[PDB]
């Protein structure tokens, strides 16, 4: 690892600088180096890791969607043959995206998840595992597509089971997990009714627990609740 010679604390410091500079590829490389030091990550460090890779893969997903749309149009009736270039370049971006997802999944498997015992860490990492398998599923078309989808489902389900046992219904990690698993149902698993049911039940159970929260916790929880409502409005 090219970060092997840099101190853990320096990698974290530079990840924060990279974020300020909107250098998310650098941020992700610094956080990968920090993970590879072998120590567990604090709450703040877990969120630096997730912010970095979410931004990187988010840009790759946006680019893949642009290219996939151009490719689809090139394959419509009446479209002029333009050669292999669109497919080739879509494949190049897709392969890079898969590489990023494989890198994140590799960090989770070696060895973040196995050392994560508290609900706030374990649910967070299992949510990430579901998310990155979901991004792989978005571009999957081959023999293993069903297994990729099932890997996402399994990770989300384990995270859900822990979150319901160990966290209050307003916990922002629990809420964001439910938001994303609901999107998995709608967009990946062809299960819009499950997606809607999950979003609605999550929202309603969070609403009922808001009375227990401080002003700052209330702000955090209601922010994610509004995203659940936004998706429900989109879907109904």
């Amino acid at each position: 690892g090219a970060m092997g010679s840099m101190e853990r604390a320096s990698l974290i410091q530079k990840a924060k600088l990279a974020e300020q500079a909107e250098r998310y590829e650098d941020m992700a490389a610094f956080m990968k180096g920090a993970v590879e030091k072998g120590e567990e990550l604090s709450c703040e460090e877990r969120n630096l890791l997730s912010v970095a890779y979410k931004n990187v893969v988010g840009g790759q997903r946006a680019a893949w969607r642009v290219l996939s749309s151009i490719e689809q149009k090139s394959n419509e009736e009446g479209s002029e043959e333009k050669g292999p270039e669109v497919r080739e370049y879509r494949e190049k971006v897709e392969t890079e995206l898969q590489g990023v997802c494989d890198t994140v999944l590799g960090l989770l498997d070696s060895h973040l998840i196995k050392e994560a015992g508290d609900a706030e860490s374990r649910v967070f990492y299992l949510k990430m595992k579901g998310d990155y398998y979901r991004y792989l599923a978005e571009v999957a078309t081959g023999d293993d597509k069903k297994r990729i989808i099932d890997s996402a489902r399994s990770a989300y389900q384990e995270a859900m089971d822990i979150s319901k046992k160990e966290m209050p219904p307003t916990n922002p990690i629990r809420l964001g997990l439910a938001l994303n698993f609901s999107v998995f149902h709608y967009e990946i698993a062809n299960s819009p009714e499950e997606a809607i049911s999950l979003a609605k039940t999550t929202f309603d159970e969070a609403m009922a627990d808001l009375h227990t929260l401080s002003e700052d916790s209330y702000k955090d929880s209601t922010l994610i609740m509004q995203l659940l409502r936004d998706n429900l409005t989109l879907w109904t």
């Binding site: 938001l179 994303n180 999107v183 709608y186 967009e187 994610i224 936004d230 989109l234």
Partner: peptide
Amino acid sequence: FPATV
């Protein structure tokens, strides 16, 4: 696209 976090 729908919202995720």
